[PDB]
Design a protein around this ligand. Structure first.
Ligand SMILES: COc1ccc(/C=N/NC(=O)CSc2nc3ccccc3n2C)c(OC)c1OC
Length: 480
C-alpha cells in the first residue's frame, strides 16, 4: 500500500500542520518520525525538545499512533527507512534557514532516487519568504519599516490547516510493534547522557498542549491593550502567558496565533484594519527569517555582506565571565543566571547583556554572544539569534549595568532571586555591592572579591571608550 512518513523537525504540533495533513491524504500507513542526533546545546533546550516529543507522542496516541524517535542523521537514516518501511511519501514543514535548506535538498535527492514523493509545506512562517523577497526585487528588506510595507501589500493569509483528527486520519493506520518504546521511544535526559541531579521542574514545559493552554491565557491578558506592553520588574519573571519558546519549536503555529490575535482585536477594537503593531512579535520574527534565508553567512561577521566589519576584541576570559554570570555586575549576572537556569529572559534584559558584551562594555564580538544564547535560550533559533545580535551590536539593520536594574527593580528582589550570595545586601548597595562599606559587606556575609567577584570593568571608562569607538566607526561607516 501507500506508506507515508511525516518528518518532524520544527512544526512539533498536530494543529495547523498542512504538510502532515497532505501526507496522510491518500495514504495507507503513516509514521511520524523525529530524527534525534544527541552527539552531533544546553540542557534546558534538550529538556524542552524531549518534552515536545513526549507531548507529540501522547497526542499521537489519541489517533492510534505513536511518535517514532530515530537516532542518527537524516542522510544516513532515511535510505534505510525508505527500504525497511517501503516509503513512497515523505512530508516536511519547509525550513527557510540556509543549512536547513541545504539538508532538505540533500534529502529530497535521496527521496527522488528511491521513488519517494516529497511534500513540503510552509507553516513555520506566516509568509512565503521567497515571495516577499521577490516583491522587494530579489533582495530581503534590510529594515523593519520596509519589511512592514512589503508585508502590508501581500495577499491575506489563508486559514490554518485543520487539526489532525480521526476523521482526517481515516483509513490511514500506523503499524506498531509491542516493543515500540524500547526501539522508538522518547529518551530521557539521562539516556542522552546528562546528569539531572541539579534540575528542578521546568519553568517552560515543552509541547503543543502547553502552547495551546498558554495561547488562551495570552489572549485573555491582551483582552483585559493591543499596544506594546511596558516592562516592569514583574515582566522579568517567566510568564505563564509567554509563547516565544513554543513559536520557536513550532508547538504553536504562528498562523493560528495570527488569526486568534486578529479575531480578538476585531472583537475588542471593532475594526478589520488593525495596525501592524498588533503583529510586531510575529513580524520581527518573519523579518529575520526573510533576511537570513538566502545568506549562509548570516551568523558571521566576515563574509557577511550586510554586517559592518567592526574590529571586536578577542578576550576569552571576559567572554566566559559574561557567559557564566561572573561579571561582578549583579544586574548582568542575575540576567545571565536566569537565562542559564531557565532558558528565557525578557527582551530588554537581552538588550542589557548584549550591549554589555558588545558595544557597551566588553567590545567582544556579537558572534560570541550569539553562540552563548544559542546554547541557553529556548526561543532564539539560528536566524532570529544572529539577526538580533547584529541589530543590538550596531552591526546591521548604551545600557548602564547598574542603573538599568536599579530603575527596573529598585528593591533588588530580582537580584536576590537569582544571586543568593547577595541577599544580605540592602537595596542601597544591591546593584553596586563594591560600593558597600566593609561593615555592610561583612554583615551581608559577602566580601566583594571573595564571595562575589568585583565588577570586571569600570563601566564609565569602558562605555566612554566604546561609545567613541562606535561614533567614529559610523562617522566613517563606508570604511567598515
Ligand atoms: C541579543 O539578543 C536579542 C536581542 C533582542 C531581542 C528582541 N528584542 N525585542 C525588542 O526590543 C522589542 S521588538 C522585537 N520583537 C522581536 C521578535 C523576534 C526577534 C526580534 C524582535 N524584536 C526586536 C531578542 O529576542 C529575539 C534577542 O534574542 C536573540
Amino acid at each position: 500500500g501507500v506508506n507515508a512518513v511525516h518528518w518532524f523537525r520544527k512544526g512539533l504540533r498536530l494543529h495547523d500542520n498542512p504538510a502532515l495533513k497532505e501526507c496522510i491524504q491518500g495514504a495507507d500507513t503513516i509514521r511520524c518520525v523525529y530524527i534525534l542526533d544527541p552527539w552531533f546545546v544546553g540542557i534546558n533546550r534538550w529538556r524542552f525538545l524531549l518534552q515536545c516529543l513526549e507531548d507529540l507522542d501522547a497526542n499521537l496516541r489519541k489517533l492510534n499512533s505513536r511518535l517514532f524517535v530515530i537516532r542518527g542523521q537524516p542522510a544516513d537514516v532515511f535510505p534505510r527507512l525508505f527500504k525497511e518501511w517501503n516509503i513512497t511519501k515523505l512530508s516536511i514543514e519547509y525550513d527557510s534557514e540556509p543549512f536547513g535548506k541545504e539538508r532538505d535538498a540533500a534529502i529530497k535527492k535521496l527521496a527522488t532516487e528511491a521513488g519517494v514523493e516529497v511534500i513540503v509545506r510552509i507553516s513555520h512562517t506566516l509568509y512565503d519568504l521567497d515571495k516577499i523577497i521577490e516583491l522587494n526585487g530579489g533582495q530581503p528588506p534590510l529594515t523593519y519599516k520596509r519589511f512592514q510595507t512589503l508585508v502590508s501589500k501581500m495577499e491575506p493569509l489563508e486559514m490554518p490547516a485543520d487539526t489532525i483528527t480521526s476523521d482526517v486520519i481515516g483509513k490511514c493506520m500506523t503499524p506498531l510493534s509491542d516493543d515500540h518504546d524500547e526501539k522508538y521511544g522518547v529518551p530521557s535526559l539521562e539516556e542522552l547522557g546528562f546528569d539531572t541531579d541539579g534540575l528542578s521542574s521546568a519553568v517552560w514545559p515543552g509541547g503543543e498542549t502547553e502552547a495551546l493552554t498558554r495561547l488562551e491565557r495570552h489572549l485573555e491578558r491582551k483582552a483585559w491593550n493591543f499596544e506594546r506592553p511596558r516592562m516592569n520588574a514583574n515582566s522579568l519573571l517567566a510568564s505563564p502567558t509567554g509563547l516565544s519558546p513554543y513559536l520557536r519549536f513550532g508547538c504553536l503555529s504562528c498562523r493560528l496565533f495570527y488569526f486568534k490575535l486578529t479575531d480578538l482585536y476585531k472583537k475588542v477594537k471593532k475594526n478589520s484594519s488593525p495596525p501592524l503593531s498588533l503583529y510586531g512579535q510575529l513580524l520581527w520574527r518573519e523579518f529575520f527569517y526573510t533576511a537570513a534565508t538566502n545568506n549562509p553567512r548570516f551568523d558571521k561577521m566576515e563574509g557577511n555582506p550586510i554586517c559592518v566589519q567592526i574590529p571586536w576584541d578577542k578576550n576569552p576570559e571576559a567572554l566566559a565571565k559574561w557567559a557564566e554570570g561572573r561579571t561582578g555586575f549583579p544586574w548582568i549576572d542575575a540576567i545571565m543566571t536566569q537565562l542559564r537556569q531557565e532558558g528565557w529572559i525578557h527582551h530588554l534584559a537581552r538588550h542589557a547583556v548584549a550591549c554589555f558584551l558588545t558595544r557597551g562594555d566588553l567590545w567582544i564580538s556579537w558572534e560570541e554572544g550569539m553562540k552563548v544564547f544559542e546554547e541557553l535560550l529556548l526561543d532564539a533559533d539560528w536566524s532570529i539569534n544572529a539577526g538580533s545580535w547584529m541589530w543590538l551590536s550596531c552591526s546591521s539593520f548604551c545600557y548602564c549595568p547598574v542603573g538599568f536594574g536599579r530603575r527596573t527593580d529598585p528593591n533588588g528582589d530580582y537580584i536576590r532571586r537569582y544571586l543568593p550570595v547577595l541577599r544580605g545586601f540592602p537595596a542601597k548597595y544591591i546593584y553596586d555591592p563594591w560600593n558597600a562599606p566593609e561593615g555592610i559587606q561583612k554583615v551581608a556575609k559577602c566580601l566583594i572579591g571573595v564571595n562575589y567577584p568585583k565588577p570586571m570593568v569600570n563601566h564609565a571608562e569602558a562605555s566612554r571608550l566604546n561609545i567613541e569607538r562606535m561614533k567614529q566607526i559610523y562617522q566613517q561607516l563606508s570604511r567598515y
